[PDB]
Amino acid sequence: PIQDGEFTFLLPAGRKQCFYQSAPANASLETEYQVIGGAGLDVDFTLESPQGVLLVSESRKADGVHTVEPTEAGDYKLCFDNSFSTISEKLVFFELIFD
Amino acid sequence: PIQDGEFTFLLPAGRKQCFYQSAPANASLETEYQVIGGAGLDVDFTLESPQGVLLVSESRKADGVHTVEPTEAGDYKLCFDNSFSTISEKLVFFELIFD
């Protein structure tokens, strides 16, 4: 594992939060997210490539694991969408990059 | 708090990591970071307003604490720049919004 991260955040009612993760070309990007506790239960998750290709789109999931291999050089975008929710949601995501 | 986040990540040599933090108007954005390890390990940090005003810009820091108050409505941009270094560095970053 050459790069790793843990991101824990409150996602307010009705809002979206994205993260920009730089990757080198020809690596493996491993990602895992989890809604914490019960509150909000689930989330809409998207993963976009550095060239803006939608790689993952899932609706109303509590958790998910997604690996990009091989990666292209640039910024991957991980987005969490809490649109229509009147309550905040606590999320954690993990990302690992392997040569 | 109305919103909190704690981010731990490896920032490789020659890379920059930016975070976007949504704030409502007339709130308090409190931020704190730490580079993990002994002496000689540091990072450049910038904090930009939603309209792109440079609010913080500091070079080769191991740590920093910054409050924006009052906030405007929009996404603050918080960047850790390791672009001018051969050493990867491990960062902890905290953000908090109070109404």
Side-chain angles (χ1 to χ4, degrees), chain A residues 1-98, chain B residues 1 3-83 85-98:
Chain A
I2 68 169
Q3 189 282 330
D4 69 322
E6 175 177 1
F7 308 78
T8 64
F9 62 97
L10 195 63
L11 180 52
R15 296 213 67 85
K16 200 177 300 190
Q17 175 77 67
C18 299
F19 294 83
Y20 303 76
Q21 181 59 60
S22 299
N26 301 347
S28 179
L29 174 59
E30 309 194 352
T31 72
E32 175 166 32
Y33 71 89
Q34 180 72 64
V35 173
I36 291 160
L41 183 65
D42 54 37
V43 71
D44 298 346
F45 176 77
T46 63
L47 178 59
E48 295 172 275
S49 83
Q51 287 171 37
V53 176
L54 184 61
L55 294 174
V56 181
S57 182
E58 43 190 21
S59 178
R60 299 295 95 202
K61 295 292 181 285
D63 67 276
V65 173
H66 306 282
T67 301
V68 174
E69 189 196 290
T71 54
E72 76 199 69
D75 288 350
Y76 286 80
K77 298 93 191 191
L78 293 76
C79 296
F80 301 89
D81 183 9
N82 195 33
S83 298
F84 297 104
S85 177
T86 76
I87 53 167
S88 67
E89 189 163 68
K90 195 147 190 78
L91 284 138
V92 53
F93 89 86
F94 303 89
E95 56 81 27
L96 277 74
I97 294 168
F98 288 100
Chain B
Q3 196 286 335
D4 70 274
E6 165 191 322
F7 315 97
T8 306
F9 56 101
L10 194 162
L11 182 56
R15 318 229 77 157
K16 178 153 96 159
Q17 181 66 71
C18 293
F19 298 99
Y20 297 84
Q21 185 53 61
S22 182
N26 299 313
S28 177
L29 170 59
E30 317 187 2
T31 186
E32 180 176 42
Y33 68 93
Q34 183 67 48
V35 180
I36 309 305
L41 295 178
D42 53 50
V43 80
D44 302 346
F45 175 75
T46 61
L47 204 173
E48 285 173 338
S49 84
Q51 295 182 59
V53 181
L54 189 59
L55 298 177
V56 178
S57 184
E58 55 195 17
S59 296
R60 300 184 36 75
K61 296 291 195 167
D63 61 284
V65 60
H66 304 285
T67 300
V68 179
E69 189 181 332
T71 55
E72 69 182 293
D75 302 322
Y76 286 78
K77 183 185 186 176
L78 307 101
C79 298
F80 301 89
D81 194 355
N82 207 32
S83 288
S85 169
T86 48
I87 316 307
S88 68
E89 285 179 340
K90 194 167 193 77
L91 268 69
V92 290
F93 165 58
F94 301 82
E95 58 79 20
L96 202 154
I97 301 168
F98 288 102

